[PDB]
Amino acid sequence: MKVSVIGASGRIGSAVSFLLAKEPYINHINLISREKSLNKLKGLKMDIYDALAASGRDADIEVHSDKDLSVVDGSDITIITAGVPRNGNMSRLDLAKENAKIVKNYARDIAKVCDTKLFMITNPVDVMTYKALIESGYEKNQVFGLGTHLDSMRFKVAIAKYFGVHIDDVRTRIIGEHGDTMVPLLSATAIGGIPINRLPNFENFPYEEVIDSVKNGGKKIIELKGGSEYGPASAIVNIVRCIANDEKRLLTLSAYLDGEIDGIKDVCIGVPVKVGKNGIEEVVPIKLEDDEFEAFKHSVEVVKEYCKEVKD
Amino acid sequence: MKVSVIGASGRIGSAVSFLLAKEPYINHINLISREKSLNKLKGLKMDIYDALAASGRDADIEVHSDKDLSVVDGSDITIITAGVPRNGNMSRLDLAKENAKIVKNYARDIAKVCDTKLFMITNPVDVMTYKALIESGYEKNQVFGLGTHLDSMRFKVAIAKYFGVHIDDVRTRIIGEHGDTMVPLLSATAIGGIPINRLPNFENFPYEEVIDSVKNGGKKIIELKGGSEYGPASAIVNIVRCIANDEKRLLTLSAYLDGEIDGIKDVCIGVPVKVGKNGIEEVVPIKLEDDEFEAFKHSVEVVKEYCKEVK
Ligand SMILES: NC(=O)C1=CN([C@@H]2O[C@H](COP(=O)(O)OP(=O)(O)OC[C@H]3O[C@@H](n4cnc5c(N)ncnc54)[C@H](OP(=O)(O)O)[C@@H]3O)[C@@H](O)[C@H]2O)C=CC1
Ligand SMILES: NC(=O)C1=CN([C@@H]2O[C@H](COP(=O)(O)OP(=O)(O)OC[C@H]3O[C@@H](n4cnc5c(N)ncnc54)[C@H](OP(=O)(O)O)[C@@H]3O)[C@@H](O)[C@H]2O)C=CC1
Ligand code: NA
Ligand code: NA
Numbered sequence: 001m002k003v004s005v006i007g008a009s010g011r012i013g014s015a016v017s018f019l020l021a022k023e024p025y026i027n028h029i030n031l032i033s034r035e036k037s038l039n040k041l042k043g044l045k046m047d048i049y050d051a052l053a054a055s056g057r058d059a060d061i062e063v064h065s066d067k068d069l070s071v072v073d074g075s076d077i078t079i080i081t082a083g084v085p086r087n088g089n090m091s092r093l094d095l096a097k098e099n100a101k102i103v104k105n106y107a108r109d110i111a112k113v114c115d116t117k118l119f120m121i122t123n124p125v126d127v128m129t130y131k132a133l134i135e136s137g138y139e140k141n142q143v144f145g146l147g148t149h150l151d152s153m154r155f156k157v158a159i160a161k162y163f164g165v166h167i168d169d170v171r172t173r174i175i176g177e178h179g180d181t182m183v184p185l186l187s188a189t190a191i192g193g194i195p196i197n198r199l200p201n202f203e204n205f206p207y208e209e210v211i212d213s214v215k216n217g218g219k220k221i222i223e224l225k226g227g228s229e230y231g232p233a234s235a236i237v238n239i240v241r242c243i244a245n246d247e248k249r250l251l252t253l254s255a256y257l258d259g260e261i262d263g264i265k266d267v268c269i270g271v272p273v274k275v276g277k278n279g280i281e282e283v284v285p286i287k288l289e290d291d292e293f294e295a296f297k298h299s300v301e302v303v304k305e306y307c308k309e310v311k312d
Numbered sequence: 313m314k315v316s317v318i319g320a321s322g323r324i325g326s327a328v329s330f331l332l333a334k335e336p337y338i339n340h341i342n343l344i345s346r347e348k349s350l351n352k353l354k355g356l357k358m359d360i361y362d363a364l365a366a367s368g369r370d371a372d373i374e375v376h377s378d379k380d381l382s383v384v385d386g387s388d389i390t391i392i393t394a395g396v397p398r399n400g401n402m403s404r405l406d407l408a409k410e411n412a413k414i415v416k417n418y419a420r421d422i423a424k425v426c427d428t429k430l431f432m433i434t435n436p437v438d439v440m441t442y443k444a445l446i447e448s449g450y451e452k453n454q455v456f457g458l459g460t461h462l463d464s465m466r467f468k469v470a471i472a473k474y475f476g477v478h479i480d481d482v483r484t485r486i487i488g489e490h491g492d493t494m495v496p497l498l499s500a501t502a503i504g505g506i507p508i509n510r511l512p513n514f515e516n517f518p519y520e521e522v523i524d525s526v527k528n529g530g531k532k533i534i535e536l537k538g539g540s541e542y543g544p545a546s547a548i549v550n551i552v553r554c555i556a557n558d559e560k561r562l563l564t565l566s567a568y569l570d571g572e573i574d575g576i577k578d579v580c581i582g583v584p585v586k587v588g589k590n591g592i593e594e595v596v597p598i599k600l601e602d603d604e605f606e607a608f609k610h611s612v613e614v615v616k617e618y619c620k621e622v623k
């Protein structure tokens with residue numbers, strides 16, 4: 001497989017370039033950045049190669065600028081981790097419009113060149129995923145965003161630590177916005193397949209304070225160390241692996257809705273999806289508790305309105 | 313296994329804390345830094361936990377200041393990546409004197425609380441390895457440095473790209489100083505076990521140009537992105553894995569010499585070693601070509617001079 005990382009010089013871009021190169025099915029990877037960062041990428045390329053030697057792995061790594069995106073041709077997946085840094089002289093909405101412009105230009109320019117899957121990380125990821133879908137003109141299965149896949153991982157850790165199990169023994173998910181209107185699914189949270197509400201220590205599990213910590217986790221990591229890095233990069237590789245080996249797993253990604261859940265359409269948002277070699281193979285309308293379903297509809301309304309306000 | 317990382321807030325310390333935690337045999341890892349960096353470590357801990365969730369791994373990560381190193385007790389391996397930044401008109405000897413004070417105090421305070429292996433990354437790594445050994449009073453099998461293990465990895469890449477093979481299909485090593493007196497061993501360089509001088513395309517292999525690039529590889533990465541990160545971190549985990557599973561491999565590390573090679577002793581430097589659960593289980597005196605051996609003796613004298621100037 002060939003993958004391209006647009007934004008490879010950033011915090012997430014550099015870490016995900018390293019982890020992707022290690023993967024045995026990833027034979028070619030393009031690190032792509034603005035011209036001013038090419039020398040950073042050359043050092044990143046040497047450092048990653050050294051790491052492959054120490055870890056028994058291999059890859060063909062190429063560095064390119066984003067002036068000529070024809071190099072993306074042949075990429076099965078193109079990961080977009082580009083984004084404008086937050087500063088004080090810009091509002092949240094101003095920053096979203098700047099990123100929307102970046103995402104649109106990349107989506108339009110990549111689509112002139114080839115058909116690839118667009119894996120969007122740029123925030124606000126649900127809005128940017130929808131923007132890239134519309135501007136690229138790609139099929140809906142080919143454009144998706146990390147979304148609440150990452151928040152699900154933060155929930156998973158806290159559950160595992162409370163119940164005293166290997167982190168991998170927990171499976172849980174959060175749907176809706178990658179944001180404060182996210183909807184954690186206690187109805188789909190299990191340890192070794194056992195719903196956590198059937199475990200003896202569940203009665204004292206402060207799950208709402210845990211959810212609050214998940215809602216606040218990204219901003220806390222930004223405050224403590226500047227920004228999330230290994231978390232998002234590993235979550236990206238997890239999805240890439242599912243696509244490359246056609247695993248068919250029920251995951252959660254920011255995906256385009258086309259009527260599967262209560263006839264809702266015209267939005268990208270965190271939902272249950274089956275992921276395989278064609279990307280988003282289906283959006284899976286699972287049975288939600290009433291509070292979960294109403295909160296998901298609420299998150300959809302909030303995200304649709306964000307999309308309209310960034311476009312305007 | 314329990315591991316402690318001293319200097320975890322730094323560039324290599326952070327990347328290596330992430331890779332160690334992923335390892336299935338590492339159940340507990342202490343991230344240790346100066347008190348002013350603990351907030352960074354708290355965020356690193358959260359970020360690593362998130363990564364473990366995404367990759368099917370697990371660990372118990374604890375954040376501690378270096379004020380009380382009793383938390384190191386029970387660590388099988390303690391990795392020291394703490395070191396000052398080389399600033400302006402600083403010589404290599406200036407660097408070594410500042411970092412030797414850091415390494416001396418860590419080694420003495422750790423030896424007060426427990427017996428552990430000391431895996432030295434702090435530069436100049438051959439000198440800091442010797443300093444940690446003497447100040448800790450540990451047995452020589454317990455103290456070693458990364459040394460030319462990292463340079464060997466850069467050599468491996470260059471060879472693999474010239475001959476067009478998987479990087480892992482190359483095995484090669486560089487002995488001597490982690491520095492510009494390092495000694496590449498073409499006599500111990502092979503692809504699929506085949507000495508590369510027996511391969512048809514070896515005649516056009518620009519050996520000398522490749523060697524010069526390897527010698528400058530660390531400096532080049534500093535120029536382009538500010539410092540190496542993933543290369544060193546992955547080379548560290550590779551050694552920890554050999555120790556944790558008692559693999560018994562012939563690798564290259566900065567280790568204490570005690571007469572194995574031409575009676576040379578009283579120095580730590582990159583040499584062929586057999587690594588296992590006890591750390592450096594032996595220094596292996598392999599057959600060197602005459603020029604490789606003279607270059608190695610030169611490297612030994614240079615490193616010894618640096619050890620004296622720091623004493
Ligand atoms: N959805 C999620 O789970 C998460 C989302 N994110 C988002 O991902 C993005 C990347 O985050 P992070 O890596 O921490 O950010 P960094 O600031 O560390 O990296 C930014 C990257 O974007 C590039 N870039 C910046 N400005 C522009 C521009 N005007 N045009 C093109 N490329 C540009 C940079 O290139 P250069 O070096 O040339 O400046 C660099 O590669 C952000 O939008 C961030 O909000 C991050 C956290 C998690
Ligand atoms: N052997 C090899 O192959 C390589 C060697 N190295 C060496 O490894 C070390 C770490 O490199 P790198 O991570 O890039 O450097 P960084 O500057 O990024 O990190 C240095 C680390 O040392 C700590 N530190 C700095 N000053 C002191 C002090 N006075 N007392 C205690 N701790 C201190 C820092 O903690 P804080 O944040 O609190 O300051 C930080 O954790 C250096 O000595 C470097 O030369 C690096 C490259 C490869
Ligand atoms: Na690979
Ligand atoms: Na582990």
